[PDB]
């Protein structure tokens, strides 16, 4: 089912959508990609009545925004006015798939108003940003500039349209609060993509989710010198016609930290066109060549029985669950050894870290694999030419005479290059702090040294995968498509971008019910594991018990036949439509309709989601 | 040196060029390609003042001509007039590289005037076409239509421009004669691409060139029922301000048959951009695979010492010198056998003949080569995988164990497919008349049966080379580029299109001083054989002595080292600029200037060629 | 589950398997491929105690058999014996995936015995071959030669092994009957791959399957001058410890024509390794380019909504159900027109027929597509170079200036080549008899002229697909992988080789419950259509009603979303393991065990199939 026909009974009444985010036209997070990929559907629903309001940055305009003249006289008039009133407001087209119009506000250009604005802010919300907080002061400037733009756009518009302003973090929350305080006619959505407290409370506290009700949010933000940022976020959530979260776990966090249950959850959709079995085969061949190089001299395990697990994303050890994955990898190593399995699990940790360079053993192993591959290819081409020559003369090859002295010299050189005594390095790079690295510390603590006995090899690649890289000449998407199972046992993950992209790429993944993507899949798929989606229970299980469940998931994945693994990959391939904005734009549409009805009930009435996007038991299981 | 700067002192005075040929926009010979490829330079020199006058044909307009409206009022007015006066004149753009404008005259549409025109013709030139000659009557219609168009274009043109009409055979010669008879102001060129008598006199008479002075052209044309066509050609040559031939041999023939020495020779140029060592290597590999298939079971000669000679073009046995080439191939076979050379010469005869289908042995040999190639590739990929696996475990391959039972079964099947007792067929096809085929008759008479003792194998391919063909999936140009030596010992060849294209493709070729291309190269290259151009002397040597000289050429080519052959191919690659219209358009320009000066000496004065296009001894020989 | 572990409790007791078929080492049918692909598993179970007894042919030995010396002294002794007794017996290795040993018998070399042998036959089975039947007389020679070889191999073998002789047609049936008549210790399997009567009765009779009980087999064979061949087949089936059929439909035919229910059905397995979505995509791109050429000037339908149905195999119009497929294609054309669908169905008929050459319009359309493709590629490379040049100078392309006069000339030439008034030809070739062709006659009768209004285009390709072909440079397997749905509504099909290979290639197929493959899938898959296997009911429905059901199948396939079609293709991809000899060799193993137990109950006891090979869904 399409997006244009969703809530088609709703008439926007020539309303104008101002989507306000600090990340509009400047990549400072993952919300930039959310806005970029959602712009297509949003502009389809709103045409040119859709404006992304961002902060002006020289890089963003240089690279992403073509500066334009306002299409309508109202926009041009407001832009000229506030440009003459001491602000520096740019208008342009964001050079992305949607081609949306962007109002960019130079917050620095209008810093002169800061003291009169933040004081004004204190006169309306009792929120006073400390001077030393650059981001909070910039948020106040951006919010006051956005509210100025909205007021001067409604004032300088004869038709006086219905304005839906959709703010996306506490950085835009100030403008939201000012829209409500000035009382100008704006239907307001507030989407929080991550509760501000949530990050600190997960990182610091031993347990954060089960203690959500037992948190003094005011006090907790107070000890961390971010009380003003917390108050800005909570006022935006409070001063919003519609409050939205990207996830149901973020919805719980916002309920217990922003003291407002989201009126709707708007999961982060994706442009699935951007992203399976033959492509997976090529990527798996490339991973297999890398593993051949990395384990040169130690290729004593069957590679056709080798499984490629990966955990990727930002190098947040506990938030991304790399600790849980490593514990489960040690337990699965024990399981595969005691069960005497011929299965091998190479688990990749693609988590960027400060690295000096590629480890010498890693680069040497890649060189050794290249040499053996070239030697085998040269000897194979010589053998093929000689064999074709022999068969052309009706002669059966005499294999003893097929290879000459030069072939044996090349092959003996290759074999000499093969010998190694040291085990393959756990990490592919030179860590600036090997002792303090959580992944390497955990690996050396649990006993995963890529030994021959270890059925689980661990390859920590503390750097993003790039095609230009010498070690792995593969970008992240192709490597992932070559893997068997993404493992993202995240503890704190308001939305799982890495597991979501893994799923869109058709790779079975392990997420958690503590992650937004994991909750979204758990509530959209009847039997997620059937579809390649393992939802680890991290809310209601201890870290040790969650490690046990992850080991169970990894072991059951290892114990699948190749036929079962293929069936499961086909199902996860089917799952990609859930994560497309063509479905997840429904929730943004309904949030905007809800806000319009709340702010303008006389003009709009809202009639309350996953219809056509439910995945029951696969018919074939 | 470029063409725009040639005779740049000449000012055309807004003259208009009408190039008249029966082959304008209808491929009925090789002059079609001459006009097509010359149109680019002609339009560069004349812009839109250049018109190709052809006969209208439904196929030509359907495929090649976009019908247009006359760009100038004069053209539109004349077209409308003569379209209202009982003719059917189309105007359009010929969809070729030059994009020239074409005036197409439907000769059938104006056949009503035939009797009053041919009678009128008899009133001006005493030439009366017999009714039964379809081509001669069509030529009279086309000539009268062209002269009508020229008269009505000069009449319906206020400026009264200087019209250069360049007619290209006796088919346009009638219009030329009428232009001169009506005395309308037209500077006329007549190019003859082949004397009409020349064809019959070469085909019938035992010796034609040495008897040129001893020919009664009137009587000779009389016995052949083509006296009117001969008179049309001779009147066109006589009634032309400039008379032109494509070759100096054609110039001699025209002097002794049309009784006029050409005022200039205009060699057939070529669009050399359309067409060397790596491309030659790929084509030679493809020819080698074909020869492996064709000689399956008989591949007892060194293929790295095998030379690929070819003769191509129309299947005219004596005119193309296939008899001389076959005699020289028998003599070269004797030379290579008595000298005990390991050199092999596979001579290809690409001369289309009525063929039922591919010979069974030929298609079977190609299938056998495909099977052996696939078997060798499969066993080679298995060997390469096993060898890479063995070298990855630091193990040297045990060649006895490398190939399995299935590899040996596949290879034994291949070897079984290899066995054959019959020698490889001389012809690749099923000739409808094997007994009457001159090439096959000569091959069986001289003893070239593709036996093992024969150092010269002969492959007659009595059909054009096509990529779509199953036997050879190669077009003519790629096959030729894979060959070592084109052999075109033509007796009658007003221009050598096949040797010229062979040279442009950078292949050393044997032509004759009886061919236009051979004469052109002989007069443009100081040492033609140094440049890969062997000029057989067929004017002043008997057929037997010319066969001896061709055997000497073939043997000296065979006796070149690979280094000498490479040097010679580099030089023939250099020769391509002689055959480009960027040089050979000079002669057409000078012919048009000469005609303008002759017809309008008051307005134009002509100042009398190969400067910058003479090739002395290569600096390196 | 594997084949080595199937009935592993059974011990062969150093038994020797002689698999006797006229098609051993000489391709004279589809049983040749059955034996060739089954040889691997059979030799895995029997090692070198497995012999494929065939008729010697010069071509077969030249191409497929490496002549060898008998590995065992018993084999060498028997070979030398019967080579010295006026017969010519070759021993070798068949150069196939299994590398089995073949005892090839030159029946011509031993024709001297024919008259006495066929006398002996009449003295033992009352079967007398008429002199004029070359195949039946060769069958008698081959059977007597096989029984001679078996008797001399058991006699010239001190251990006296347990010999399992598995004969495969009525051509080997004579040898089977003689094995039983001489009473020599041979455990005999008879597999019939197609009842001899059934082939004649499917066509000649008004309707064959519903009249099986109402057939006088003796009389019916008599009218067709094949009574001796019928009696040979029926005696082989009768004189067999185990009787086997390749299908349950063949089992019914054998019950009602050979008067013996098969003791087991041994479906024709296949070497599935020899044969899905990216490969399908490439093949579908090739088919789409062919359709672009074929329908040049008439490409007014969405090709992303175009479905490629095909029917392939031997050009038996009624047996292969091409009539039913064409009727259903006309009905589906009506359905897609009245429903105003943008779906297009190009149905290919890959059924070889006597063709003079490629039709002029067809070759011209392929040339036009090649020219347009080359023109588009040339203009695209020029545009790409100019666009890269413009972007390298920081300049946005001026699209008006991007294409030059030469580009427009090339494109205008291409467009000129595009125009055509005649509709795309229904057939790609020049039929030697257009009026006599059943497919073309039916197409012109039902109104499928590849018109613009027709939502169903029909391309009859009356020739095998070859890569060497100029028209379609794709072999049969790649073309099929590019198709959406194989349609094999066969009436007579003892085993569906074409639908089976279709399924192994991961392409959904329509078969019938009158086909062996269709019955096999219907009894192995709970919901066959879910797996891309549509079983048309042709036993219990009239030809018109079967046409209606086929139209329903085709229409429901057309009405699947691309998601549903992908799911269905994934399931049919799963189905390939059912058709592998790794599973279907189980039935041959159990038939051989059953025959061993029947002939040697003292030495062997048989303990009775699809376990691990049933598909719930």
Residue numbers in the entry:
A (entry chain B), B (entry chain D): 13 to 287, 293 to 625, 630 to 642
C (entry chain A): 13 to 287, 293 to 625, 630 to 638
Source paper text:
Glycogen is synthesised through the cooperative action of three enzymes: glycogenin (GN), glycogen synthase (GS) and glycogen branching enzyme (GBE). GS is the rate limiting enzyme in glycogen biosynthesis and as such its activity is tightly regulated. GS is inactivated by covalent phosphorylation at numerous N- and C-terminal sites, and is allosterically activated by glucose-6-phosphate (G6P) binding and/or dephosphorylation. Here, we report the structural and functional analysis of the full-length human GS-GN complex and the cryo-EM structure of phosphorylated human GS.
Density for the C-terminal GS interacting region of GN allows for model building of residues 300–332 (human GN34). Four GN peptides bind to the GS tetramer, and these residues form a helix-turn helix, where the first helix is denoted binding helix 1 (BH1) and the second as BH2. We were able to build a model for the N-terminus starting from residue 13, and of the C-terminus up to residue 625, and then from 630–639 (chain A/C) and 630–642 (chain B/D), that could help understand the mechanisms of GS inactivation. The N- and C-terminal tails of each GS protomer lie almost parallel to each other, and travel side by side along the GS tetrameric core to reach the centre. The C-terminal tail from chain B continues to travel further across the regulatory helices than chain A, prior to traversing away from the core. This allows chain B to engage with the regulatory helices α22, specifically phosphorylated S641 interacting with residues R588 and R591, which come from two GS protomers to form a positively charged pocket we have termed the “arginine cradle”. S641 is a major phosphorylation site involved in the regulation of GS activity, and interaction of pS641 with the arginine cradle in helix α22 shows the mechanism of inactivation of human GS through constraining the GS tetramer in a “tense state”. Each human GS protomer shows a closed conformation of its active site, and a regulatory loop that only becomes ordered upon G6P binding is disordered in the human structure.
